[PDB]
């Protein structure tokens, strides 16, 4: 079964670093494109970004030249190195293999937790 946990979130002060973590077993992770999602309080699951198995990626607009994700296919992981946090990214975090923006089912599971718990991201004004 395709089992995600991840880790790596925190608590820090507006302009910090966190680099986020997800293991993958139970599923061929080196054939699976890999997504982070995440979601605050009242907002939709978005995608921040993701890596296809052909080690291309895709970051949201809003994350671009901040974030970088990458992957090590001999550890079945994903990780988002996430720099110059801002107040707007505080959410849970969740790693799925899904990469895909448009809301629908199957992204909407992502944040819900249908995958794994996420990691709690809280990026605090100074």
């Known amino acids: 079964q395709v089992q995600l946990v991840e880790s790596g979130g925190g608590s820090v002060q507006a302009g910090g670093s966190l680099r986020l973590s997800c293991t993958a077993s139970?599923?061929?992770?080196?054939?699976?494109?890999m997504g982070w999602y995440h979601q605050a309080p009242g907002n939709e699951c978005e995608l921040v970004s993701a890596?296809?198995?052909?080690?291309?990626?895709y970051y949201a607009d809003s994350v671009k030249g901040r974030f970088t994700i990458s992957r090590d296919n001999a550890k079945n992981t994903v990780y988002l190195q996430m720099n110059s946090l801002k107040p707007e990214d505080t959410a849970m975090y969740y790693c799925?293999?899904?990469?895909?923006?448009?809301?629908?089912?199957?992204?909407?599971?992502?944040?819900?937790?249908?995958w794994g718990q996420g990691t709690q991201v809280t990026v605090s004004s100074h």
């Open positions: 799925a293999a899904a990469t895909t923006t448009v809301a629908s089912p199957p992204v909407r599971h992502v944040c819900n937790g249908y």
């Open positions: 139970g599923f061929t992770f080196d054939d699976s494109d």
């Open positions: 890596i296809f198995s052909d080690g291309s990626t």
